[PDB]
Amino acid sequence: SRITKFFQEQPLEGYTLFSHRSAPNGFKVAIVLSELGFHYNTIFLDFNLGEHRAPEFVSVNPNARVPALIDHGMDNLSIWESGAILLHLVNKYYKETGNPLLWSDDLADQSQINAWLFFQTSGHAPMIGQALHFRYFHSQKIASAVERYTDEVRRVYGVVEMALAERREALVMDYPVWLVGDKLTIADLAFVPWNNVVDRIGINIKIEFPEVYKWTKHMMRRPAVIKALRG
Amino acid sequence: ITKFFQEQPLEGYTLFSHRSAPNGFKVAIVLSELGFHYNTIFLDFNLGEHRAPEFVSVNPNARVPALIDHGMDNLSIWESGAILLHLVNKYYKETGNPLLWSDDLADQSQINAWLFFQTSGHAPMIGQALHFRYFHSQKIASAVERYTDEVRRVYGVVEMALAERREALVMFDYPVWLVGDKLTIADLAFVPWNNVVDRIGINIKIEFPEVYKWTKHMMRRPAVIKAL
Numbered sequence A: 001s002r003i004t005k006f007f008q009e010q011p012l013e014g015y016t017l018f019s020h021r022s023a024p025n026g027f028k029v030a031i032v033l034s035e036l037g038f039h040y041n042t043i044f045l046d047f048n049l050g051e052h053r054a055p056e057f058v059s060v061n062p063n064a065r066v067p068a069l070i071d072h073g074m075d076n077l078s079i080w081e082s083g084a085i086l087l088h089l090v091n092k093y094y095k096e097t098g099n100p101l102l103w104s105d106d107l108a109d110q111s112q113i114n115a116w117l118f119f120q121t122s123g124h125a126p127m128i129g130q131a132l133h134f135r136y137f138h139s140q141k142i143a144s145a146v147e148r149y150t151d152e153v154r155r156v157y158g159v160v161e162m163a164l165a166e167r168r169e170a171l172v173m174d175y176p177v178w179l180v181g182d183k184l185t186i187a188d189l190a191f192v193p194w195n196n197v198v199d200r201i202g203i204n205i206k207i208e209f210p211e212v213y214k215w216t217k218h219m220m221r222r223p224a225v226i227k228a229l230r231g
Numbered sequence B: 001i002t003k004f005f006q007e008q009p010l011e012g013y014t015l016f017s018h019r020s021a022p023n024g025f026k027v028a029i030v031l032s033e034l035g036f037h038y039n040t041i042f043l044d045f046n047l048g049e050h051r052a053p054e055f056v057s058v059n060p061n062a063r064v065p066a067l068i069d070h071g072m073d074n075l076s077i078w079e080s081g082a083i084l085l086h087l088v089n090k091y092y093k094e095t096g097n098p099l100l101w102s103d104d105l106a107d108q109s110q111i112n113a114w115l116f117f118q119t120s121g122h123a124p125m126i127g128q129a130l131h132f133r134y135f136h137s138q139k140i141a142s143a144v145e146r147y148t149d150e151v152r153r154v155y156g157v158v159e160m161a162l163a164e165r166r167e168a169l170v171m172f173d174y175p176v177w178l179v180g181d182k183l184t185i186a187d188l189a190f191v192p193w194n195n196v197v198d199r200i201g202i203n204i205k206i207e208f209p210e211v212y213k214w215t216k217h218m219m220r221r222p223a224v225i226k227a228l
């Protein structure tokens, strides 16, 4: 019913973010939302109560997962999939102000930003999730599965590390380094919520990925980021 | 390979893929539908070409597909999702026609939603399902069930979306699409993977009728046939 009444009286403006206090993809969206100055409220869904199975929610997000965002100012447009939401945001912020904050107005740069973005949503997140699953939630213990995904997650972090190290190397010919166009974009941010959980599968970023550590730290010091991870 | 790079083309595209990568063919399909002239370089994992230095420069993730937009000073683009967004975007900027795309930000977010859904929730699960059924060191039914079920849940979502679309259309043999009653990279991104799920015991024809029709319409497209 909680979800019901809300869809009975939705704000004519602003944004509503459906998330979960455990969903990194949710906090990922909160961060961007916060960095762009977008005012919004969060509705943490109780999966225990099966609220994510509520008809009103499946309408918003047919995949019945989080995050899902509602752009009220746009006739209550519903955007699901964190990657889709990030793009909708940087695009909307750009057409409105003329400044491609956390984005780019150059086609080539966007292709670069998207690459890291899809890589994060397609190869980073799913893997951390499969690792966590066998390590902690499977119906039985399967060391080989845990090792498969743990390795993979290490492999993907190696690509990011190597990339960051490469960017640093280039500028030499603890200064902050970024994935695309020497500027903070949604590319860098997408990884932040996750970097904070991989410890749970035995990965020690600070130690095994020095570049990723500095990187995450620079981002962890931004007001908007802190605000999001607290809300 | 090494040669190719020092003797790279001035215009067009070069698609690095693999005979078994649905991801790669997804790009070829879009490349074709958009009329972009391109050549494909199939990497044999045997010789470990995808591990080679020059390729990693194109794709740090050392995976296929990767794409070189020669007209843009050999711009390197990796991750099938990003490559698709790059193509529709470039096509639109050049002709002022959102083919397989859209000029409405609302429609774009929906297309992007289905696109991310396909690349982050469809392909990864199919791939895991394949691994545990055919290539894992040990045979484990629980792992296989985990992924086959999830893939079946994903299709259900799509099947439902399409069914709701057919529902509306009827107010009756016509094609139905995910977004804007028009074919887009959102519909196309599932095509190659659709033709692969049978390898994990899923019969689309019987289990997902609307997905069967939908797939059929795309499979009958000439641009699609060629690419494949």
Ligand SMILES: N[C@@H](CCC(=O)N[C@@H](CSCc1ccc([N+](=O)[O-])cc1)C(=O)NCC(=O)O)C(=O)O
Binding pocket: A022, A023, A024, A025, A047, A064, A065, A066, A067, A080, A081, A082, A083, A121, A129, A132, A197, A200, B116, B117, B120, B121
């Ligand atoms: N591709 C979608 C994936 C969304 C997704 O995986 N959502 C998960 C939460 S993030 C996965 C996750 C949850 C918790 C942790 N953790 O460390 O505690 C890590 C990852 C969910 O809704 N789960 C509810 C359910 O199905 O029951 C996107 O990026 O938006």
Ligand SMILES: N[C@@H](CCC(=O)N[C@@H](CSCc1ccc([N+](=O)[O-])cc1)C(=O)NCC(=O)O)C(=O)O
Binding pocket: A118, A119, A122, A123, B018, B020, B021, B022, B023, B045, B050, B062, B063, B064, B065, B078, B079, B080, B081, B119, B127, B130, B196, B199
């Ligand atoms: N998120 C990336 C994922 C790319 C990816 O997974 N690439 C795979 C090939 S498609 C994976 C695949 C192969 C075969 C089937 N099949 O059904 O036969 C399905 C999927 C690769 O390069 N693999 C190198 C390797 O083998 O190490 C993207 O969307 O582009």
